Amino acid sequence: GSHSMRYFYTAMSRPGRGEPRFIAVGYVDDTQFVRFDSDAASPRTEPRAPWIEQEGPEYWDRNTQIFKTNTQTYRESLRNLRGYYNQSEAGSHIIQRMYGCDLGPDGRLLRGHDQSAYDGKDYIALNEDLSSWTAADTAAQITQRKWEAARVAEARRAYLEGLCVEWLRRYLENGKETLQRADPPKTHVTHHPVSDHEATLRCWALGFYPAEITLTWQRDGEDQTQDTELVETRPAGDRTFQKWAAVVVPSGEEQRYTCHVQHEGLPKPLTLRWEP
């Protein structure tokens, strides 16, 4: 199938409570595999999935140096951004970055990503061409000029098309038994009356990986988007995810309702009904 790798950086100021905390986590698809936390007793890159443990000390030291240097630069960046928005030194602020590469089913580069946010709003993003930037406001334009002057995009491109793809392929191979295994949802439908004349039908999907899934109710074959209660896909803690969709139906009309499930792990999309 298709696969992606992403690093997620969070730098958070906290005036009066020390220097800004920097965390970095790395993912392949929905699997975290590394973390670094400047607040750890002894800050260093730590493995978070078994298939990455085989990497040698050189790998871990390389990662740690990268994250330590970034820790320092992000503190400078926070200072710079507080100034770009004329903000007081009293408040706490957050820069976030997420970046990485997507591979198609044949293992070739589909596209790269490098996006940043400040206090939870789009700030600056590398365009799909990996050569130009989109700045969200006049502050991000200052960053854009600075990054253009320094040929930053060129460096991001070289990484996204080069090492990012190369290492993602390495991890996909080393962790093939899990990273390249899709586990289908285990599904069922529950029924409980809400009153004399109405009942809830709930369609469950459990144990699936990756998280991407489609779960819908149909009445007489028509989508019931508006009347369906759909919870956010949620992690079980064993790598897998869970989700349900519920609809309230007129007692007796249960068989007019069908639940449809699409997931990568499924050969054909499933259709389910309540089975008394």
């Binding site: 990268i66 240097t69 970034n70 820069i95 940043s116 960053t143 990054w147 460096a155 990012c164 290492w167």
Partner: peptide, 13 residues
């Protein structure tokens, strides 16, 4: 692997 450091200094925002 995360983005490696450049030869020079890392460019801040």
């Amino acid at each position: 692997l995360p983005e490696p450091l450049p030869q020079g200094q890392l460019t801040a925002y």
